[PDB]
Design a protein around this ligand. Structure first.
Ligand code: HEM
Length: 116
């Protein structure tokens, strides 16, 4: 589907093959980058605080809720995707995993039916 693992600072730790196809970064390019490289403004500039905020408050806004958001490709094109976040820990540090479902086709079908 598309899978991404980040550390508690938002740095990409793992980047699945499907993720590469979906976003247009290669694994090496992507690893060691902030996850925000995947989103547009204003979310890009806020994502760190989203993360900071959750770590302190421990109130989920998307964790085990899911949400549809706009994702951003390497070539600058944006698209809708469903996102679910999981919390994990390893070596005492927290890790987040995101499962992505590309909603591009659903949106286009819907737009196209509306337009007709
Ligand atoms: C690529 C496009 C993404 C966008 C546009 C996005 C957007 C957001 C937004 C809007 C929030 C805050 C929700 C709120 O305050 O109401 C948030 C929180 C968060 N995001 Fe993302 N996200 C993206 C990808 C990811 C990925 C791939 C991960 C992890 C692998 C991730 C990890 C988190 C975490 C850990 C939080 C705080 C958790 C929570 O509040 O439940 N994000 N993100």
């Amino acid at each position: 589907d598309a899978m991404i693992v980040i550390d508690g600072h938002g740095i990409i730790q793992l980047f699945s093959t499907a993720a590469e196809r979906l976003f247009g970064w290669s694994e090496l390019e992507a690893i060691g980058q902030n996850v925000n490289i995947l989103m547009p403004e204003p979310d890009r500039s806020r994502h760190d605080s989203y993360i900071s905020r959750y770590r302190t408050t421990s109130d989920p806004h998307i964790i085990g809720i899911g949400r549809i958001v706009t994702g951003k490709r390497r070539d600058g094109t944006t698209f809708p995707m469903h996102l679910s976040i999981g919390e994990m820990q390893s070596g005492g540090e927290p890790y987040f995993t995101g499962f992505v479902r590309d909603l591009t086709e659903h949106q286009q079908t819907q737009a196209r039916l509306q337009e007709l």
